[PDB]
Amino acid sequence: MELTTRTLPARKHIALVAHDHCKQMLMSWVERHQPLLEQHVLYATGTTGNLISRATGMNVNAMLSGPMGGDQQVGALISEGKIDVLIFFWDPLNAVPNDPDVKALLRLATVWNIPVATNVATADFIIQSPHFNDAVDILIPDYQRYLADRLK
Amino acid sequence: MELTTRTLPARKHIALVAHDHCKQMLMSWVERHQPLLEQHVLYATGTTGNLISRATGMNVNAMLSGPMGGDQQVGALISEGKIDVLIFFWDPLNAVPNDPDVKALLRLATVWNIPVATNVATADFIIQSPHFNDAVDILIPDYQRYLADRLK
Amino acid sequence: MELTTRTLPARKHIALVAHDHCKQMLMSWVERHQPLLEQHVLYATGTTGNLISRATGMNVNAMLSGPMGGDQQVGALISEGKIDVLIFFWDPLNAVPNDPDVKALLRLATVWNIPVATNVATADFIIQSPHFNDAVDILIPDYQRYLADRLK
Amino acid sequence: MELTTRTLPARKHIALVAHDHCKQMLMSWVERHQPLLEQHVLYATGTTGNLISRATGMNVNAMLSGPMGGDQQVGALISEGKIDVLIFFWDPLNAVPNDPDVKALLRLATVWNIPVATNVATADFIIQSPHFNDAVDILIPDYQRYLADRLK
Amino acid sequence: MELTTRTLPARKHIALVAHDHCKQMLMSWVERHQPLLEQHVLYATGTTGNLISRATGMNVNAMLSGPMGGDQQVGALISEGKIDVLIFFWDPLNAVPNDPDVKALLRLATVWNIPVATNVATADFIIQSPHFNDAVDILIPDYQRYLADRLK
Amino acid sequence: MELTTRTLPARKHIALVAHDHCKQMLMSWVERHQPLLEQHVLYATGTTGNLISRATGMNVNAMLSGPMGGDQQVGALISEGKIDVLIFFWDPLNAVPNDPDVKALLRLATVWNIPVATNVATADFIIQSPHFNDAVDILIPDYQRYLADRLK
Numbered sequence: 004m005e006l007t008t009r010t011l012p013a014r015k016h017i018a019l020v021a022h023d024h025c026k027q028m029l030m031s032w033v034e035r036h037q038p039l040l041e042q043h044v045l046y047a048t049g050t051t052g053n054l055i056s057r058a059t060g061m062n063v064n065a066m067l068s069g070p071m072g073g074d075q076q077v078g079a080l081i082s083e084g085k086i087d088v089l090i091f092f093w094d095p096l097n098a099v100p101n102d103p104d105v106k107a108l109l110r111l112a113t114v115w116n117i118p119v120a121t122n123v124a125t126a127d128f129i130i131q132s133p134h135f136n137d138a139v140d141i142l143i144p145d146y147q148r149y150l151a152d153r154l155k
Numbered sequence: 156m157e158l159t160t161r162t163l164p165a166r167k168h169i170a171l172v173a174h175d176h177c178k179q180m181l182m183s184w185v186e187r188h189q190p191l192l193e194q195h196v197l198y199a200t201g202t203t204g205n206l207i208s209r210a211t212g213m214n215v216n217a218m219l220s221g222p223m224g225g226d227q228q229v230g231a232l233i234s235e236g237k238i239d240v241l242i243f244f245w246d247p248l249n250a251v252p253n254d255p256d257v258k259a260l261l262r263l264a265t266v267w268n269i270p271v272a273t274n275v276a277t278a279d280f281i282i283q284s285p286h287f288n289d290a291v292d293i294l295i296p297d298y299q300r301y302l303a304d305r306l307k
Numbered sequence: 308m309e310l311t312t313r314t315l316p317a318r319k320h321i322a323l324v325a326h327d328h329c330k331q332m333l334m335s336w337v338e339r340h341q342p343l344l345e346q347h348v349l350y351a352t353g354t355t356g357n358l359i360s361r362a363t364g365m366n367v368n369a370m371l372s373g374p375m376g377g378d379q380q381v382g383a384l385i386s387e388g389k390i391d392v393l394i395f396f397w398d399p400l401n402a403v404p405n406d407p408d409v410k411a412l413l414r415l416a417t418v419w420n421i422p423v424a425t426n427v428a429t430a431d432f433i434i435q436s437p438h439f440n441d442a443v444d445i446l447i448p449d450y451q452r453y454l455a456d457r458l459k
Numbered sequence: 460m461e462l463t464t465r466t467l468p469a470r471k472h473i474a475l476v477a478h479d480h481c482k483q484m485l486m487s488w489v490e491r492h493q494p495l496l497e498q499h500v501l502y503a504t505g506t507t508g509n510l511i512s513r514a515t516g517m518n519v520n521a522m523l524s525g526p527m528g529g530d531q532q533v534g535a536l537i538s539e540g541k542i543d544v545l546i547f548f549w550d551p552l553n554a555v556p557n558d559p560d561v562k563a564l565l566r567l568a569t570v571w572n573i574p575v576a577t578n579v580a581t582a583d584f585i586i587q588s589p590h591f592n593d594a595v596d597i598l599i600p601d602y603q604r605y606l607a608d609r610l611k
Numbered sequence: 612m613e614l615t616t617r618t619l620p621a622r623k624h625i626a627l628v629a630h631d632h633c634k635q636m637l638m639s640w641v642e643r644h645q646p647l648l649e650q651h652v653l654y655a656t657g658t659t660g661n662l663i664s665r666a667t668g669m670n671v672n673a674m675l676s677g678p679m680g681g682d683q684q685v686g687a688l689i690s691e692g693k694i695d696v697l698i699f700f701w702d703p704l705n706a707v708p709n710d711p712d713v714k715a716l717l718r719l720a721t722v723w724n725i726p727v728a729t730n731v732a733t734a735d736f737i738i739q740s741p742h743f744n745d746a747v748d749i750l751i752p753d754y755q756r757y758l759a760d761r762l763k
Numbered sequence: 764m765e766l767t768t769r770t771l772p773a774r775k776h777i778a779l780v781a782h783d784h785c786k787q788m789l790m791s792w793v794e795r796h797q798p799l800l801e802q803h804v805l806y807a808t809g810t811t812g813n814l815i816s817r818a819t820g821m822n823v824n825a826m827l828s829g830p831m832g833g834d835q836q837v838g839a840l841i842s843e844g845k846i847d848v849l850i851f852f853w854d855p856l857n858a859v860p861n862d863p864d865v866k867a868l869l870r871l872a873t874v875w876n877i878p879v880a881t882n883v884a885t886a887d888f889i890i891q892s893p894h895f896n897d898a899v900d901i902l903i904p905d906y907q908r909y910l911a912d913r914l915k
Contacts, residue, residue: 004856050305057306068302070400072234072263075227082224095873096678096708100400103258104230106866109881110255111224113855116882121869124876124901125889132888141884146223153202153220156400222856247417248526250554252856258410261425265399268426273413276420276445277433284432293428354609361610372609374704375602376538376567379531386528402706407562408534414559415528450527457506457524458513460704467732551721552612552830552860562714565729569703572730577717580724580749584740585733597732658913665914676910680842680871683835690832711870714863719832754831761810761828762817 007145009084011117013138017088018077019047019055020069020108022099025092026051030058032123036130037061046086048073074104078111084143088135089119090126116141159297163269165290167239170229171199171207172221172260174251177244178203182210184242184275188282189213198238200225226256230263236295241271242278268293309456311449315421317442319391322381323351323359324373324412326403329396330355336394336427338363340434350390352377378408382415388447393423394430420445461604467573467595471543474533475503475511476525476564478555481548482510488546488579490515492586502542504529530560534567540599545575546582572597615753619725621746623695626685627655627663628677630702634659637700640731642667644738654694656681682712686719692751697727698734724749767905771877773898775847778837779807779815780829780868782859785852786814792850792883794819796890806846808833834864838871848878850886876901 017040021029029051033040037059045063047055052065066076080086089112093105112119118135120126129135169192173181181203185192189211197215199207204217218228232238241264245257264271272278281287321344325333333355337344341363349367351359356369370380384390393416397409416423424430433439473496477485489496489511501519503511508521523529536542545568549561568575576582585591625648629637637659641648645667653671655663660673674684688694697720701713720727728734737743777800781789789811793800797819805823807815812825827833840846849872853865872879880886889895 049302053302053306067234067298068305071266071296071298071301072230075230075234075259075263078227079224079231082219082228093873094708095870098402098706098708098710100398100402101259101262102402103255103262106255107227107253107259110253110855111227113853113881114223116884118885118888119881120885121873121879122876125878125880125885128878128889128892128895129885131894132892134888134891144223146219149223150201150205150220154205245417246556247414248556250556250558250858252854252858254858262399265397265425268428270429270432271425272429273417273423274420277422277424277429280422280433280436280439281429283438284436286435287432353606357606357610371538371602372606375570375600375605376535379534379538379563379567382531383528383535386523386531404702404704404706405563405566406706407559407566410559411531411557411563414557415531418527448527450523453527454505454509454524458509549721550860551718554858554860566703569701569729572732574733574736575729576733577721577727578724581726581728581733581737584726584737584742587742588736588740590739591736595732595735657910661910661914675842675906676913679874679904679906679909680839683838683842683867683871686835687832687839690827690836709867709870711863711866715835715861715867718861718863719835722831752831754827757831758809758813758828762813 005145005148006142008140009143010138010140011087011134013136014043015087015135016044016046016085017090018080018086019045019051019063019090020074020077021051021092022094022097024094024097026054028123029090029092030054032126034059039130042136046077046080048077069104070101074101074108078108081111081115081117084115087117088129089117091119091121093121114144116143157297157300158294160292161236161295162290162292163239165288167195167287168237169195169197169240169242170232170238171197171203171215171242172226172229173203173244174221174246174249176246176249178206180275181242181244182206184278186211191282194288198229198232200229221256222253226253226260230260233263233267233269236267239269240281241269243271243273245273266296268295309449309452310446312444313388313447314442314444315391317440319347319439320389321347321349321392321394322384322390323349323355323367323394324378324381325355325396326373326398326401328398328401330358332427333394333396334358334362336430341365343434346440350381350384352381373408374405378405378412382412385415385419385421388419391421392433393421395423395425397425418448420447461601461608462598463601464596465540465599467543467597469592469594470499471591472500472502472541473544473546474536474542475501475507475519476530476533476545476547477507478548478550478553480550480553482507484579485546485548486510486514488582493517495586498592502533502536504533525560526557530557530564534564537567537571537573540571543573544585545573547575547577548579549577570600572599613753613756614750616748617692617751619695619747619749621744622651623743624652624654624693625696625698626688626694627653627659627671627698628682628685629659629700630705630707632702632705633700634662636731637698638662638666640734645669647738647743650744654685654688656685677712678709682709682716686716689719689723689725692723695725696737697725699727699729700731701729722752724751765905765908766902768900769844769903770898770900771847773896774803775895776804776806776845777848777850778841778846779805779811779823779850780834780837781811781852782829782854782857784854784857786811788883789850789852790814790818792886797821799890802896806837806840808837829864830861834861834868838868841871841875841877846877848889850880852883853881874904876903
């Protein structure tokens with residue numbers, strides 16, 4: 004598939020998501036990096052988002068709870084180039100009912116080539132990276148040509 | 156889980172999705188019922204959408220292609236009460252790349268209790284039902300109450 | 308591929324299956340439509356079946372419980388043209404051990420093109436549909452042609 | 460859970476199933492042990508069963524093809540205690556459409572505790588075992604106590 | 612695909628694994644077969660292995676707990692040809708977090724064609740089989756040729 | 764549960780894995796950062812490894828091909844604390860036979876909290892991160908305590 008470029012802005016649109024057993028883990032991480040995160044645009048699934056705004060006082064755009072469709076809402080935003088970073092702490096030790104949604108979301112994040120962290124170590128590596136606070140160009144699939152070839 | 160209601164408008168917002176090996180099967184179903192479908196509002200994933208509007212002249216609100224995010228866009232619309240009927244002809248004899256997206260879409264449609272058809276027989280029954288062209292209430296989960304329980 | 312036709316009888320052979328968290332929904336639905344379900348022949352997996360028979364007094368041919376093989380028994384009956392309608396309320400908010408059995412059953416229902424409802428709205432539309440109490444022809448794959456093409 | 464006992468007959472009801480890329484393997488295996496297999500009752504999925512009977516002249520009770528519902532037909536027979544042994548050479552290297560049916564089939568063979576082989580090595584150890592031609596007691600879930608528990 | 616052969620030594624390297632609900636079963640099975648098992652080399656996942664040695668006094672090479680990587684460690688050993696027999700009593704009635712690991716390990720055992728038992732009935736037939744203590748040749752995929760093709 | 768800590772050495776042990784449709788993408792990424800990667804220890808699955816070394820002349824500890832067990836070999840080393848970073852470019856637009864193996868590897872990489880990149884953007888952010896060349900502490904599950912409770 005042919006590729007094209009997209010610019011991730013200096014102020015990132017970050018999606019924050021965590022399963023219940025990983026919530027306290029995501030909360031700790033968000034709290035120790037708050038000064039930095041307060042500089043970007045935050046999005047989150049329903050429960051996670053409300054817990055964060057409650058604990059940190061930061062402004063978060065909360066979507067629907069994951070099981071109720073929040074996961075796919077974030078997925079759609081990503082496919083629309085509305086999300087630049089995805090922090091998804093899914094539980095690797097307890098199966099969830101929205102497992103397909105979880106896999107679907109990660110699949111799309113892979114496809115659209117945006118930075119993705121599924122654990123703390125990766126999250127720290129990402130936010131400490133130089134281009135986290137600067138604009139940078141990434142290579143994304145050329146959807147227009149992808150679609151055109153589908154209709155030939 | 157506490158339930159509430161939502162009213163499906165007389166002119167239904169119908170999403171039409173089909174995997175490649177099912178596109179001809181969907182095309183034919185749409186042509187056979189065009190006189191009826193013309194009275195409603197059509198949505199579809201990228202490829203399916205363009206193939207239809209071209210072969211019938213009907214106006215279809217085409218989202219991104221399934222693999223590229225279309226399925227999740229539809230799922231999001233469903234969870235937001237913007238889609239009232241789902242017609243999804245997925246291939247039952249051929250694994251696909253966006254299988255998780257497929258399962259996640261069907262799960263949400265189940266959750267939000269909207270009429271869903273995954274084959275021709277079900278689609279025919281739904282479309283021939285008396286209230287297909289009428290406003291009718293459906294029971295939906297009470298998100299607000301559901302969320303509160305979560306933040307407690 | 309290669310398709311032929313089957314005629315669903317006026318007196319439908321209906322399979323009723325529900326996951327625990329959805330059993331009350333199914334039960335209520337059955338009670339509200341007992342007059343009509345009174346006619347037609349009813350089948351069900353173990354637990355679901357006995358509960359219905361025990362609360363409504365209707366005759367129900369109960370198979371093994373889902374986890375014990377009931378889903379596959381229904382599946383087999385469908386592929387053998389013994390089931391005409393499938394009412395399957397699977398839980399979209401909880402994971403189950405017989406998940407593959409569930410997906411397998413829905414795959415076969417799709418393949419054999421019979422009316423399938425996975426939520427109340429879909430069930431209501433199918434049962435309210437005019438040709439629900441009539442003989443209706445459905446397009447089904449021609450197994451003979453399919454098998455012949457396998458042993459070429 | 461409650462467990463009771465069942466006796467596997469001296470003369471076993473064997474189910475033979477193989478995916479397309481494993482068919483030649485199953486065929487050879489069958490040919491090498493034909494004299495012994497002819498002493499038992501043979502069952503198979505559509506394609507597999509015909510290929511075997513056409514090549515060996517053996518009497519095989521062929522079910523529908525796997526993708527068309529044969530796997531579930533076998534699963535049901537196992538759950539009903541009509542299949543005592545399962546030889547299923549599935550393909551661990553290729554896609555395969557009826558994947559859930561495959562997992563569901565193996566799930567039931569595990570649940571109902573019957574000898575199961577998914578490769579030649581295991582198939583050989585099983586058929587060469589001293590009690591392959593004898594009656595053998597196996598522990599199986601006690602459905603009665605299971606269902607009774609599910610109710611009341 | 613090119614196939615070659617490997618010889619399973621007379622003294623087998625057995626891997627023993629069991630999900631929680633099946634541990635008691637495996638334990639008892641091991642004790643009733645302790646005489647024969649002592650003549651072999653035993654391996655097991657963290658929890659399973661410790662319980663066994665702490666009850667039978669037998670020497671068991673315990674890997675990591677399954678959910679922590681045990682299943683994959685066993686998987687690697689098999690592909691490396693260091694495991695000859697796999698006795699894996701996985702829970703067919705309860706969803707586990709390491710589900711993919713479970714499936715991946717079973718996939719590999721199938722690929723490398725080693726004797727595998729997933730229930731007691733199969734475990735008994737395999738262990739009593741004549742060549743369980745003899746050196747036996749098995750067909751395995753010829754990796755050397757398989758790799759060479761990949762690099763053409 | 765109980766978490767302990769581990770220190771990734773300044774000289775990282777990097778695992779490189781890619782599905783066929785992503786190999787060209789990984790090669791390009793590798794050569795683009797060869798100067799830096801040259802200072803670290805590289806590991807990879809069969810095909811990927813050979814293709815890399817045979818192209819850059821860098822030393823690569825190649826494992827078996829993914830479908831043949833290499834995915835689990837890598838997963839095993841990660842769980843053993845031998846792999847510090849994982850670059851896994853899996854195909855998001857094409858389903859693979861060793862899919863369970865793929866998910867299991869990703870699951871373990873999540874549990875053991877190591878930096879994980881599934882696309883180029885994530886890989887670049889990690890490798891461009893300042894502490895990529897420093898000794899860094901990461902929180903990991905306290906296995907000892909974990910196992911202790913299991914045997915309480």
